[PDB]
């Protein structure tokens, strides 16, 4: 029937003045654009069919052609920025927004999907979708007493498109649009479907990836406890965005970090810092590095939760990027911590792995490690235990690494190693 049409035949049908022939040709185009391998998007565009599809979007009297054209345009918009732009230049944005209020659920869903692709192109098309007025009808679709009454796929597509409206930076989404969307996002974050939860967490992670004012907009909604709960989830597609959001939040002020701590986040990090997924371990260690950059009482809560041994473990064995995040966490700890906290760090066995990491080629991790060593030596000075620390570093083989770095190409490493050797060895 409408399977395996040539683009020539699609054009001939769409150019007929017979609405049923146009419908059949548009369905043939939809099937062609829905094929697994190499959908001929560019051929359809070059055939000049986008304006016809856009006009069909407005055929309220023929819902089937509305649906078929919406699907075809969705799939065109799913491609490169040039193809998405071709869809936008045809006038598709206001037509899809008008379809959001269709009485046919599959047509409304298809319009949601298409607007999601368009907004997902980037900040410019995101903001253009917003300016055409998409947020109000989108959120109206979710204004029901119980989200569970909605079809699962419909709700997932709505959540995904909203997440794209929260996505991208330079610029970040308009503040008023974020304020308009956030309440529905909180509600979705309490939903039970794993994909809705994952995409809601992704949206929150986008919204917290910015200055402290954006983070504050999010944390004011009271979502941090739910984020920590989701951080404890079994589904990795949920844990990943939840952890990203928590890390973003702890890049903010000490009070926002404290909201994360008060919600119980630290209790999850024994598992996260040993998680078999390398990305989770790296992100959790980065989050820890930003928590140890906080107040001394926050460092103390890190200590009380027993997380220093886990940082020693990650420093001792992990993917190198995770080890660099751990080196950062240790340097922040030693920069902000009390003398007692630093000596505790030493008692947990930090020196040996910290020195073993000095064999790395990355210059920045070497600088970080040397800064940490200097801070630890300063605490030792305050206690008159500099000699014990020097003996420890010499026994683990770190003095050799430092005296070798004395001949390092970078100036900072050179000077820091020379200072350490001349001052304590």
């Amino acid at each position: 029937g409408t399977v395996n049409w040539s683009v020539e035949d699609i054009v001939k049908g769409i150019n007929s003045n017979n609405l049923e022939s146009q419908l059949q040709a548009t369905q043939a185009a939809r099937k062609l654009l829905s094929r697994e391998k190499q959908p001929p998007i560019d051929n359809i565009i070059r055939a000049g069919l986008i304006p016809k599809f856009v006009s069909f979007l407005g055929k309220t009297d023929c819902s089937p052609i509305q649906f078929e054209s919406a699907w075809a345009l969705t799939n065109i918009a799913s491609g490169t920025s040039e193809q998405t732009k071709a869809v936008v230049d045809g006038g598709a944005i206001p037509a899809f927004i008008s379809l959001l209020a269709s009485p046919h659920a599959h047509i409304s869903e298809q319009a949601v999907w298409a607007l999601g692709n368009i907004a997902g192109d980037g900040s410019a098309f995101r903001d253009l979708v917003i300016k055409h007025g998409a947020i109000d009808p989108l959120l109206a679709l979710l204004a029901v007493p119980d989200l569970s009454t909605l079809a699962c796929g419909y709700l997932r597509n709505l959540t995904w498109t909203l997440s794209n409206l929260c996505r991208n930076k330079n610029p970040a989404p308009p503040l008023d649009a974020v304020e308009q969307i956030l309440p529905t996002l909180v509600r979705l974050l309490h939903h039970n479907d794993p994909e809705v939860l994952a995409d809601s967490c992704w949206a929150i992670s986008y919204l917290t990836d910015g200055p402290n004012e954006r983070i504050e907009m999010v944390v004011k909604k009271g979502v941090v406890p739910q984020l920590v709960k989701l951080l404890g989830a079994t589904e990795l597609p949920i844990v990943t965005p939840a952890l990203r959001a928590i890390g973003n939040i702890v890049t903010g002020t000490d009070e926002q970090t404290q909201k994360v701590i008060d919600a119980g986040a630290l209790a999850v990090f024994p598992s996260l810092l040993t998680n078999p997924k390398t990305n989770i371990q790296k992100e959790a260690t980065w989050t820890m590095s930003n928590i140890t950059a906080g107040r001394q009482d926050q460092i103390q809560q890190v200590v009380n939760h027993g997380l220093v041994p886990f940082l020693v473990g990650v420093l001792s064995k992990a993917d190198f990027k995770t080890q660099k995040e751990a080196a950062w966490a240790i340097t922040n700890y030693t920069s902000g911590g009390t003398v007692e906290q630093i000596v505790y760090l030493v008692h947990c066995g930090i020196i040996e792995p910290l020195m073993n990491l000095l064999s790395a080629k990355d210059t920045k991790i070497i600088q970080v490690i040397l800064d940490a060593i200097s801070n630890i030596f300063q605490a030792a000075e305050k206690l008159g235990e500099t000699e014990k620390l020097s003996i420890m570093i010499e026994e683990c083989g770190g003095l050799d690494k430092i005296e070798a770095l004395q001949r390092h190409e970078n100036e900072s490493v050179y000077k820091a190693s020379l200072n350490l050797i001349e001052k304590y060895f």
Binding site: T74, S78, Q110, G116
Partner: peptide
């Protein structure tokens, strides 16, 4: 989460 999605 993908930036764009094709409907198959």
């Amino acid at each position: 989460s993908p930036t764009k999605k094709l409907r198959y």
